[PDB]
Every structure is written in C-alpha cells, then in structure tokens.
C-alpha cells in the first residue's frame, strides 16, 4: 500500500544543465512515482523530462491534482536542511484522501525526496536568503472521462533554486485589495487543503488588485467581512486586543485556512516565549477598523514558505485606504520572528524543526 | 485574435483504431483538434491523429487548475445527417471559462467550424443506433512552464471525441436515488460553480463514493443555511408541482452565481415557456418547500437535465436519516416523457429545427 525509498531507482543524466525570478528553472533530475491497479510501481529519479498524458486524463479535465511546497536551506556548513518537512507530508497525504487519490508512506516519500534533493545537492544555493523550493504534486492519470475514483497516478517532485524573497536584504511591506465580492473558500469546502483548484480561480482577483494599485489580495469571508489569508499566506495581527491585553492572533483552522506550516510555527515560536498572549481566533474587518482607529494595532503581517513573514502597511477597502501601522511598529516581531526562523533554517542553531539531507 | 478554420492542418492518422457494449468517456475516434497559444498568438489549428499530450512538470494546468472544459452531442439523424445541439451555448459558455481564467479568447464561430471539420473526419465514428450520440469534449488549459501563479503566456486548446450508446438501457426511463447531506457543498456565491472549470469536479468524487456507500446513485448538492437544492450530480434540478399559491408551475434554481448554466436547463426553460400551459419560473428550491410539497402531494415530478441524460428523473432523495420517495414515475411522468420525445425530434433531424447546426 505504499512505495518504498529502498526499491529507488536512480538513472542519472547524461547532459547535465548548467547552473544559473521565482518557479522558472529547475534542477537535473525530478522523482517520479506511478500508481495503479497492482499497486505503486518503484519509485525512480530520473533527469528533469516531460510528462506524457492521455488527452483524457482526470488532472486535467477534472482537477485531480494536488501539491505542496517547503523549502531546503544550505548553512554556511554547507549541510542543507528541510524546514519541518513532516507537516509537508502529513498536509500532502490529507490533500490526497479528500480528492480520492492513492494514500503513500509519509517517510518513504521524505526519504524519497532526500534521496533526490542528496542527487542535486549542487543545486542549492547559500547566498544569504536563499533555498530550494520543492514542489511534489500527485494527480489523477485515469485515461476516461468519467468523473470517478482514479485507478491510476502520478506522484512527482520537481526543485526549484530561488534568490532572495526580499532584494533589499530587508522585509518590504505590502498593500491589500479587500473586496467581499471574491471569495477564496467557503466552509464546508475544500480550501484548508492544498488543491490546484484552490489557485486559478484566483488569477483574475489578483489582476483586479493590481488594476486597483495593490500588491495582493485580502481574502474576506462572511457577512462579519472575517480576515482569512493575504494572497497565499496566513494572516497574523500583533495588537492590543479590546480586554487591555497584548496579544498575537491568526485566524482558527475552522475550514476556510490552508494549515501552514510557517503559521504554525510562528504559534509554536510565540507560544515558547512566554512573553504575550498568543491565540487562535476569528479577525472581523470592524474589530481591525476599530483597533486602527483606537491607536491598538501594532502589526499585521502574512507568513508562508514564500516570504516567510510579510509586512502589510496598507489595505484598500471599500474605496477606502486604510493605513496599517506596521512598519512604524519596528516591527519589531516581524524582525524577531525572521531572524529566529532565519538562524534555525540556516543551521546557526541547532533545532529538531530542521531535518538534514 | 484567434485561430481560423481556413488555416486547419489535417494529419490523417496511419493507425486507426478498430471500432466496438459502450461505456461512458473510455472509448476514443481516430482524430483530436489541436490549437496551441502563445507569446505570438494562437498558432495554426490541427487535426491530429488521437494521442498523448507532452507537458513540461511545471504546467500550469497541473498544478493550479488553470483548465476547464466543456462536453456537447452530436446526433445522426433518420436522414444520416450528423447535427450538434445548440453548440453555439457552449462555445459561449467555453469563452465565459476562460475569461475567468485569464485564459486566451478566442473566435467562438471559428472554433465551432473546426470543431465541424473535426466530427467531419471522425463522421464514421458516429452511432446511430437510437439514443446514441458522440459526444464531443472541449479542453483549454494554461501550458506555462513555472511555479508562478499568474496569468499563463501558453495555453492548449484540444478537442477529442466519444461515441456513447443510449444513456437509458431499452430507452425506458429510469429513476435515480440521491443523497442530500448538507455537510457537503459544491459551489458557493462569490465563487466559480457558475463556470465549467475543472476545480469544481475533483472535490465531488469523495462525495458520490459517499452517496454510493449510503446506498444513492448521485448527490443532490446543498447550499446555504437553508438548504437549497441547486444540483444532482452534474445536472440542473427541476421540480415540476403545484406551488404554495396554488399554481402549476415547473420551478429550476437561478443563475445567481452557484448554478451551472446548462444548454439544456436553458432548452427546457424555452420549451416550457413557449408552449404557455403553465407557469415557468426560476426561483430557490429549499428542502424545507420540498418536504411539505411532499406532505400535500403538490409534488408532480422532479429531474435532472444534462447533456448525458438529457432528463433523468428522480424517485427518492435520502435527506438525513428520512428515505423521501419522490412521486415522478407515479405521475407518468408526464413532463420528463414530453420534454424528452421534443428534444428527440429536434435532435435526430424528425423535425428541422434552428436549435440544430449540420456537420
Ligand atoms: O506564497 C506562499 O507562501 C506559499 C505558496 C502557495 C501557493 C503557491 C506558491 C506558493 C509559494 O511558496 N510561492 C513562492 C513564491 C516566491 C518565492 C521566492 C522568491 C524569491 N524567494 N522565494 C518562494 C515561494
Ligand atoms: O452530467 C452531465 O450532463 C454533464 C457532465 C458534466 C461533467 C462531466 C461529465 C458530464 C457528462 O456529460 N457526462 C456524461 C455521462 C454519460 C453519458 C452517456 C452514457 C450513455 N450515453 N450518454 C454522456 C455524458
Ligand atoms: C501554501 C499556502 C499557505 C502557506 O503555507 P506554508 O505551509 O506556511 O508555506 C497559506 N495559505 C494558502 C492559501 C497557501 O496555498
Ligand atoms: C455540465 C454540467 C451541467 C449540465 O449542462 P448541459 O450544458 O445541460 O450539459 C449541470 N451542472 C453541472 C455542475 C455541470 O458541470
Ligand atoms: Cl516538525
Ligand atoms: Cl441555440
């Protein structure tokens, strides 16, 4: 009932690529999995190469498909590490049941994507700020057109070097398209897992934002106008909180949020220190409109594997712009989370988060 | 702008595959229509010989769903004449998709034009047993080879064909059980149940494998706290009875943003409103309307209507713990045999009709 990292097949490259903007160039060699009626094949790496589809295939007509996204970071030891790829897993295998596609081992598929990122280890950058992106999808191969369970798969891993998120060397703040009109996902529905289908839809609510002078979305849910997530990213709000106390909240996994693995530790690192009060709640447009009015916010931020963590000092609601304090706030756990993250990710101390290649 | 039919390549294939007892969606015509776009424009069309798409690992079309489709008949007629139902409803409709996918446009008349030179090709793979079609399915998804979630520079449009038999075994109509569970929703207003993309299919397939476990044959999709019937399965709803003003009327949810604007939802709201015998209306359903239409015996029939079936009738609706039975076969059923001999004629060239564009 699942592929075994033992069974790998590695087929090296002959012409190898030669080393160097975000998702456009790819490393050497690529894992690839198939699954069927008998079961999954062997697992084998093989160079970087194309997929071949029947025309009929149910990731394309019918969106069964799914993927993940984590990042490799290489330490001046030159040793490179995955930041808490175990969450990757278990959120992938989640993703995988609710669209009915094969279940794997969560260990096998890690050793597996070890294995290849150990293959093209040359690949991973260690200028300051920088990683590799891994992206493992797993879709839907039936050749019919009928929509049903599939009884055939593909799983594969693809790894992409990216540069510095932010050039200065410095988190730069964004702005904030808040429009009740779109909505990212609905409860009861499937956006707290990690589906393609939760993505294009969004094309065009991120063109309208541009068009209307702002960077990224604000995804709005309710008729209580909620704050969910920012563009791909979970939304964080540092402000004292209407009872007089100092406090850190982000939206609860009530449905309608991706569970990130970046949000997650930011509870986890904030919860460690003790110094605040750090809570899970629903964030209405009207208690941010009256905290900002009543001088009480200090920071409002979005947290992803992209960014890691992203400043928002402004949001466009309503024709309206609302100025958010955040940069003016230091900000000062905006910087205390990125430098943590930072010198965990980046080996400068050691943590079990980390999980070697 | 767009591709053009007078541009069509057409590579006649060197291995035709042999001809058939058939299933649904697995059984494929010789020749696909093929249209690629790019920074230049969409390039020549083709007729190609059927076979496997090459897609770089990065593809927007796999990994966020920048893909969508669209599924049309085409009938052969007493008279030997291949027709297509209303395909120009789908074109726009196709066109509609894409916009919301900033996905390229395209001229709606040339496609159709390729899509007839298309069928032309595969003619010999159109049954004409009664009740069968070939049914032709439309295909445009990004191409853009990057991580990036953004507007794609490629995109592929393709079309393949299917012959199916009759949907109904000895032509008889035959009912359908469904599974109303409110813990599970389709579509929702603000977002893109409206469009035939396929994000809103995948998430359904652990539902029905639901509704087969609870012993139904397709989900009848509810929305809202108050439990609106939208749906079944991917047809439009229809409830034919009398409502709570005393009035015979043939009821289907409206476009508000979480129906699926079918071709024949749309053809069956046409009929019923040209032949004037009763009221016509589209207005929410709610179960809670259902229940007590059911208690009082206004209910008439109720139906799916799709390009697969065309209109499939429904018997129970397992809502919750409670088995309703849903009286339509009791009442003939009038409506459904009506609308299904009309579109039959209009269909197989019985009686020449603007609805119908000869291949
Ligand atoms: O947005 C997120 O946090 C998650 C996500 C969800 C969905 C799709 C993609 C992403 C993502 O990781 N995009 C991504 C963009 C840019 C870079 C980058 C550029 C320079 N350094 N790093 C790294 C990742
Ligand atoms: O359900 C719909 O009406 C639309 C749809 C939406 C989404 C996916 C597929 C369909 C569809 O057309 N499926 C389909 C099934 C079976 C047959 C058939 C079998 C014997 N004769 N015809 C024809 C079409
Ligand atoms: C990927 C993603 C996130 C962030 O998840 P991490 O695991 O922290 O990278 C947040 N929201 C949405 C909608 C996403 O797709
Ligand atoms: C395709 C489809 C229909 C029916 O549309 P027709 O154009 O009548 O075939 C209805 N509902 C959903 C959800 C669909 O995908
Ligand atoms: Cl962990
Ligand atoms: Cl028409």
Redesign the interface.
Same mark, same amino acid.
């Given at each position: 009932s699942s592929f075994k990292a033992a069974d790998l097949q590695l087929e090296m490259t002959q012409k190898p690529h030669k080393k160097p *903007?975000?998702?456009?160039t790819?490393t050497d060699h690529?894992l690839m999995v198939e699954w069927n009626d008998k079961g999954w094949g062997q697992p084998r790496i093989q160079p970087?190469?194309?997929?071949?589809? @029947?025309?009929?295939?149910?990731?394309? @007509?019918?969106?069964?498909?799914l993927?993940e996204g984590m990042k490799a970071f290489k330490g001046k030891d030159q040793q490179v590490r995955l930041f808490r790829p175990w969450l990757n897993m278990d959120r992938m295998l989640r993703s995988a049941?609710?669209?009915?596609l094969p279940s794997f081992d969560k260990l096998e598929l890690l050793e597996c994507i070890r294995r290849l990122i150990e293959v093209d280890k040359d690949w991973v950058p260690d200028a300051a700020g920088t990683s590799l992106?891994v992206?493992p999808?797993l879709?839907?191969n039936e050749?019919?057109?009928?929509?049903?369970?599939p009884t055939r798969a593909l799983l594969?891993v693809?790894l992409?070097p990216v540069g510095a998120y932010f050039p200065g060397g410095s988190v730069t703040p964004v702005s904030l398209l808040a429009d009740?009109?779109?909505?990212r996902a609905? *409860?009861?529905?499937?956006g707290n897992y990690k589906?393609?289908?939760?993505?294009?839809?969004? *094309?065009?609510v991120?063109?309208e934002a541009l068009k209307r002078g702002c960077e990224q979305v604000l995804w709005l849910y309710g008729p209580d106008h909620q704050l969910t997530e920012v563009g791909?990213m979970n939304i964080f709000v540092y402000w004292t909180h209407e009872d007089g106390v100092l406090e850190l909240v982000t939206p609860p996994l009530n449905g309608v949020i991706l569970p990130g693995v970046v949000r997650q530790s930011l509870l986890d690192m904030a919860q460690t220190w003790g110094e605040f009060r750090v809570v899970e709640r629903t964030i209405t447009m009207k208690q941010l409109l009256r905290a900002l009015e009543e001088g009480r916010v200090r920071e409002v931020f979005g947290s992803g594997t992209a960014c890691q963590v992203c400043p928002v000092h402004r949001i466009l609601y309503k024709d309206r712009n609302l100025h958010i304090p955040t940069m003016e706030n230091g900000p000062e756990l905006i910087l205390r989370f990125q430098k943590e993250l930072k010198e965990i990710q980046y080996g400068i101390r050691a943590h079990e988060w980390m999980f070697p290649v």
């Open positions: *903007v975000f998702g456009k790819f690529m970087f190469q194309n997929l071949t589809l @029947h025309p009929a295939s149910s990731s394309l @007509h019918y969106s069964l498909q993927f049941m609710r669209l009915c992106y992206r999808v879709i839907g050749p019919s057109l009928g929509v049903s369970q594969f693809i992409c009740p009109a779109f909505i609905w *409860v009861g529905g499937v589906l393609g289908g939760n993505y294009g839809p969004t *094309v065009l991120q063109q791909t």
